[PDB]
Design a protein around this nucleic acid. Structure first.
Lengths: 63, 156, 124
RNA sequence: GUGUAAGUGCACAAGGGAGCUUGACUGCGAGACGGACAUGUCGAGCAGGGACGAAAGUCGGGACUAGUGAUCCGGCACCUCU
RNA sequence: UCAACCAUAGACUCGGCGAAAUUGCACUACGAGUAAAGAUGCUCGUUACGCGCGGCAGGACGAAAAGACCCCGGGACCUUCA
RNA sequence: AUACACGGCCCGUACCCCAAACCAACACAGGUGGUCAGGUAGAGAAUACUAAGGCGUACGAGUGAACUAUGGUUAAGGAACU
RNA sequence: UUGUGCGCCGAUAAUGUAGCGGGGCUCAAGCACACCGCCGAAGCCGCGGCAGCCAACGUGUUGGCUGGGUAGGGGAGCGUCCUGCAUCCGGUGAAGCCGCCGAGUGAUCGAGUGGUGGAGGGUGUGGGAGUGAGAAUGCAGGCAUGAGUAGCGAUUAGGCAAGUGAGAACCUUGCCCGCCGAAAGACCAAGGGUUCCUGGGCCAGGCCAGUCCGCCCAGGGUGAGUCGGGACCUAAGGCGAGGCCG
RNA sequence: GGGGAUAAGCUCCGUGCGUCGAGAGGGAAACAGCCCAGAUCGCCGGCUAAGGCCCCUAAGCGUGUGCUAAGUGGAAAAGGAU
RNA sequence: UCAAACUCCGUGAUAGCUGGUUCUCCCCGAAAUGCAUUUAGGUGCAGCGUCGCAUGUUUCUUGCCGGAGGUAGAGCUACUGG
RNA sequence: UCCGGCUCUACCUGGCUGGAGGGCAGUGAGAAAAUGUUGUGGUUAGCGGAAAUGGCUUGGGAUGGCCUGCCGUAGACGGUGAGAGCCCGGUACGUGAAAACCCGACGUCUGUCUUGAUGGUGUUCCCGAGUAGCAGCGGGCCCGUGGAAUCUGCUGUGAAUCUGCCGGGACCACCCGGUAAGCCUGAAUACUUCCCAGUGACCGAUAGCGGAUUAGUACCGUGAGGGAAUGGUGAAAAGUACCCCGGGAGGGGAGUGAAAGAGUACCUGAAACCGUGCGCUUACAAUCCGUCAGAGCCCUCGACGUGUCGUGGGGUGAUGGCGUGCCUUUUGAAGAAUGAGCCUGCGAGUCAGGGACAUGUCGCGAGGUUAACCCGGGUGGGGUAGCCGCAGCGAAAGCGAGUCUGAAUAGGGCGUAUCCACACAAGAGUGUGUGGUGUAGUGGUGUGUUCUGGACCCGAAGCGGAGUGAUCUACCCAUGGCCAGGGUGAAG
RNA sequence: GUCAACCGAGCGUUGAUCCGAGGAUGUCCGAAUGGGGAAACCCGGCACGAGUGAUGUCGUGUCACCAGGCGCUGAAUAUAUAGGCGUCUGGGGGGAACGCGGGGAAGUGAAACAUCUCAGUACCCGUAGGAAGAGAAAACAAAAUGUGAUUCCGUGAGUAGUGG
């Protein structure tokens, strides 16, 4: 049979044009009462995945 | 191990016995026991594409043509009565090599029925024309109807 | 498809057990016991091939030294003398001389006597 | 003495005191540290709109490092998204 | 204390039938020592004619049982205001 | 009531049966329910000898070994053994 | 009185010298300082063969460096079976097996020959694998060491003559002897199933042998109005028309 | 360098320090980690390292000058002693 | 055989666990450390290995110049304490 | 279409009840039974069927080799004394069925519309009721109670008939589609106890079905239930007549036979293992059992000479030196840590799948390739539904070589194959606008890892479902039997 | 017939042995069905027939249960019913898989685990057929002027989504 995909890795990982892998960043949802805005501001956007986990993430996304 | 007869009872204790540990009387290391990684009923076909196939066939016919082994013929016989002696004499006229291919259509059954029984010959219809049957040969005898069909079927 | 294994084993069994005709007991009959001893055997042969050089050289030296000492010179000073004199003969052949022709060996002894330094324990 | 443990610093004061006052902002961020990874730390400089000051200029919390808890699932306000 | 003697079934000898568990090998000494820290097998010395029979039971970390005490992991069954 | 002539079905009957024939893996010192119950001594179906009756049962012949098992007697003392 | 170089006592554990590795050594074969030589390793060199990386050149030659290796990564190969295709040997003796003589750097090889034996095999190229065993307290069969050892199944105990027989401790008979005798005796039920009798037999079996046997083969043999059961009856309990529940 | 008794063949950290692991050969009496040295195969060739030259064991009962009298060499303390 | 029988089936149950895993040569060749961990005997990532491509000496070594450190040591009427 | 009678009734019409030509249909799902012809239509036995005693040699036997001929709508296969197109059996091919069975074909037989239809026109009536719907617990639908439609099960409640009702992912209004709660329906599809005919890069007696051999047998278990082992003489039994030893087994001669190194223990006939002879060696010696040197003796080949060394080779090998089994697992094992008695045979990274990623190779090339399926005696032709690429950014609308955020061209993020050449700005690390060079992916296959499956092999304790077991033992029920002999001396 | 020979006695061109289709016979147990029963073995009834001086015996048939139809009667009890008696037709059990409706786990995976998964699988039940079931729109769709019963295959798609 086919190779089934990983839900989480599909919902928390996408791919751009040139094959990069992309994620979002952490400590953004709650407890913002005391987090300064610069700390709240480098956590926005997306970020390219590390090197070390690229392979693992390929194997999760594809099959 | 899972299709053989029996074996579905632990034949004796785990301990106290002296002898080894065993869980079925049909495991591989026994004598009567299951094959482990055995043959299985499987398919062997593989999906070669149309373009590679036809490229093969054209190249093969070229290999024979350049060396002047493609002969043509209208027929192998006189009217509607098979006689293998006729076809054999005619192939003696036309050829001396051991093996040979014959391409006769469907309706011209007499040539097929005639030349069938010969030792070397291996007859074929050009609708199922292939490559093994070409390359195994030394000479190839087309009918003219066959050539025309082949060519006006491929060329369009 | 099924491939009985008989021939493909018999080959090496025949080899080994041909190569262990002379061994004494289960080392001369049985493959699982002669294989081991073949390991040890070839290994000990290797080691002895490297070391019979030193064995023979030891022998040659003992012969030379006893010959010389019966002509009243020590080995060490004999070889000092021949080194000084540029003489080229090796120890295998000095021993052969000692055995066969002691006269020639005594002549070589005399050469070394002549060519040694005067004051052997000098600070030079 | 430095709000609170200890260290590093502070008299050139970051210690003590008085007047205005809300930058205890919004939109970003070059280049860097540290770095298994996720986290974490500083950051000049640009724009609106301001404070203080005569101006230069400083202000994106506290002398610095601790003072808190990822993700999921729900909740409140606003949006010219469906 | 303090052990002695006697008879039967065995044990020993002869004729017959004739197994067993165990077994890496083998023409399988002792000492002081070295070493995975208790050596038939190594070192250095000492002793010993080859082959058997009856007998003892100090060792071969003897045979038996993939420890039953302990610890870890998994189960089981039992309890209780989990 | 008398006489005569007739019928009177099915199954098991051998053989072992406290056992070399059953249960016991063996021609196994084990287990198996029921029935008559000789004599002399004796309270007695105990126990000793025996009639009827039945077996000598399936490896033997030897031999003053140690030692082990079941038996036997023991000077003087009498639980000191433990 | 200082500092030194060797020294003394303190010193002292259990299988046997036993705190030089031993003999032995001060007529140092012991310590120190200088000196001379030498032995010594798979190190280096010397003569040869192979191999990997690079480089130079010419249609694969040479040269320099290199080459311990477990977990492990990569590369190149032998062998076995079945097959597509082409060719070769084979009852004028294939395979397989025992070999002898030889070969390859190795897995291995002999189209090199002898003996045995009796019908399929080899070669080159490709294809596909139930594709290589020395270990799993591994499975199946066969055979060893222990070993010609322990045992041979009770506490009743055997013997002499004669007998047939190829062959007698044991089988048949004779006379003795000894054992049980509320049993080791005679009769039934369950249970087993021909074990019973006769005739013949002893390559297997009997814990020895055996002319013997519950062993082997063939044949024969079990007779019921009244015996133990059924056709006569019912208890425990079972099955259970209809039936009720589900 | 810590803990320990500034004991452990103890335990825990550092170290472009080492070796063993995965590494043979020589020396250390025998001796994975010590010293030397890092094995392509052959040779009945030569020179050397560590170490050692009375015999066992191939090489020097080597040369020179002094000490040692204790079998020191070939275990050892506080301390004692013409 | 009973702290919950036996047989067939699910079932080839599952084990962070023990054992075992077969022909050859050539080249290179480790680690036993870090963070996390229902985790410490396992595993994930980083570390060290090789294969292929890319970048070409950027690595390493020695010399010279530039830079911060608060260790050994020493010192204390140069502070805190004895 | 004609009439017979009927519309209660005689009379004009409208509407029924009959028969008749006819048509339609039929064993249909649409009503159902049998009928008799009936097709070289099919199945259930079979049959014919071409061509060499060919020659020489080998051999026990020619079906072999070599040389001569032939047949062929038949050289598929097998057997026959060794590979047989021409010997046999049979094939290609054509034949063949009294009876039974199955297909249709018919005529019977049966119905069935025919008394009819096309359209008009304004309003009442009907359009499947304990149901659909709603609420409460629940099942299953991608959907685990969630905003959760549609489909549904049990209870409780409970409506209308066409401006009616149900759905179009809560719900409401509009439009759209459709007309529930009555019923039947072939063909495509799945499967093989049995039967018939064949194929195999499947096994070939420890394999293959457990079963080539009496096989679900023997044997085990009370019982359910487990569950084995054993193939081969040779061409044909011509199976050793006869004699000798022996009680017999068994054997030696004589024979058969091509061979008895084929004797009913029999094709070949390995190793372990068990012995007999011949040569060397071994009883003063401490041995992981070997290796290096090697005396001595014995065998052999060769050059020679009355026996003799050699570019020798082989078996034994006194004596000397060196030397601590194999594997697994361990920091570290010769290890007194595990495992192995020995031989022989058997026994563990496999397969599927347009699966995923990486990489070699081959075709095509800004294109590449088909799936199911259809036709094909075969491996071949077709089949455009699909998928991957060719433009991305953004949560999304949406925009587009740019886009997102933001008030912002003001910075940044992502993207615009890459390089190349000229410019302008800065050297806060280079950027921005031009020009050209022009982008490479895909489908087969091989290798490695990998996902789902028993997933390299063996191994539990123990979980669940359905059944077997109280003949042992625990207890109870129903019904019978057994307890020698001697003492004590309660109540009354 | 055969393992499987041996012996004996025979048949067959008047067509044997052998093969095929239909018939006949078809002991006893078995759904088992007269009653009973420890499966293959015990006892009977009724009609007829054979047989004995009569009985015994023997042979041929038939007798269970329910569901339905028909027929006779209509108990307590009045209507009348359940029930009872006779006759006629069905069903009853076996099967290798395949199907439809219903019930319905657990070890396993989650590195624990209960929700979840394994699986609505194994297994159990009731009924079938040569195939079954479903099946003629109270359906899809999206303003395209569309499709037109159902089922099974390929794709869509391991996607939209669902999910401690």
């Amino acid at each position: 049979p086919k190779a089934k995909t990983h839900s989480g890795a599909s919902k928390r990982f996408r791919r751009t044009g040139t094959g990069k892998i992309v994620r979002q960043k952490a400590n953004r949802r709650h407890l913002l009462e005391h987090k300064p805005t610069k700390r709240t501001r480098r956590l926005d956007g997306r970020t390219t995945v590390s090197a070390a986990d690229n392979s693992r993430i390929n194997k999760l996304l594809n099959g | 191990r899972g299709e053989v007869s029996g074996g579905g009872k632990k034949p004796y204790r785990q301990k106290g016995t002296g002898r080894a540990r065993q869980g079925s009387t049909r495991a591989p290391q026994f004598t009567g026991g299951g094959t482990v990684h055995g043959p299985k009923p499987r398919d062997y076909s593989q999906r070669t594409p149309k373009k590679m196939i036809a490229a093969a066939l054209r190249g093969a016919l070229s290999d024979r043509a350049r060396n002047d082994r493609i002969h043509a013929v209208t027929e192998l016989v006189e009217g509607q009565t098979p006689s293998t002696k006729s076809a054999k004499t005619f192939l003696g006229t036309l050829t001396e090599n051991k093996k040979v291919l014959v391409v006769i259509g469907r309706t011209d059954e007499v040539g097929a029925k005639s030349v069938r029984n010969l030792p070397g010959v291996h007859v074929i219809s050009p609708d199922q024309l292939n490559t093994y049957d070409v390359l195994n040969a030394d000479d190839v005898v087309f009918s003219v109807e066959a050539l025309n069909a082949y060519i006006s079927a491929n060329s369009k | 498809a099924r491939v009985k294994r008989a021939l493909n084993a018999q080959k090496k069994r025949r080899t080994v057990l041909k190569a262990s005709k002379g061994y004494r007991g289960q080392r001369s009959r049985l493959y699982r016991k002669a294989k081991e001893q073949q390991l040890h055997s070839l290994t000990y042969a290797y080691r002895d091939r490297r070391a019979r050089k030193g064995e023979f050289r030891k022998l040659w030296i003992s012969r030379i030294n006893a010959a010389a000492r019966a002509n009243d010179i020590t080995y060490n000073r004999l070889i000092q003398g021949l080194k000084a004199a540029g003489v080229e003969v090796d120890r295998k052949n000095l021993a052969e001389l000692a055995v066969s022709d002691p006269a020639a060996f005594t002549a070589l002894v005399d050469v070394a006597r002549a060519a040694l330094p005067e004051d052997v324990n000098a600070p030079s």
